[PDB]
Amino acid sequence: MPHAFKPGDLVFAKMKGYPHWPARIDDIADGAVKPPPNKYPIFFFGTHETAFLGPKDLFPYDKSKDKYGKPNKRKGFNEGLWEIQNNPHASYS
Numbered sequence: 001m002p003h004a005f006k007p008g009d010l011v012f013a014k015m016k017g018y019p020h021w022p023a024r025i026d027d028i029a030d031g032a033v034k035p036p037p038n039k040y041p042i043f044f045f046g047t048h049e050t051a052f053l054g055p056k057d058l059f060p061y062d063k064s065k066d067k068y069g070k071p072n073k074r075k076g077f078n079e080g081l082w083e084i085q086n087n088p089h090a091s092y093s
C-alpha cells in the first residue's frame, strides 16, 4: 500500500499547459526556502526547474512510465527522460 510522498520519490509531475513531466520530490536544504503547506518541492528533469505542487499533480513514476515516458518535442523533455531513468538521484545544480 502507498505511503505519503517523500524526498527522492520519482514521478511525472503535471503542470498546466505542459505534458506530464519526469521529476522527483526534492529535499529542502538547510537554510533554503520551504514550500507552502500541503506542497512539495518538485525538481523537473531536463529543465532543472523547481515548482511547488500538491499530490493531485504527482504521478508515481513506476506506475506511469508506460503512459508518459515517451519522447516529446518540448525543450528539455528528452534530457529529462534520460535523467529519470539513468541518474535520478544525482546533483544537477
Ligand SMILES: CCS(=O)(=O)N1CCC(C(=O)O)CC1
Pocket (backbone or CB within 6 Å): 015, 018, 021, 044, 047, 048, 049, 050, 051
Ligand atoms: C514543468 C515543465 S518545466 O520544467 O519546463 N517548468 C515550466 C515552468 C514551471 C513553472 O511555471 O514554475 C517550472 C517547470
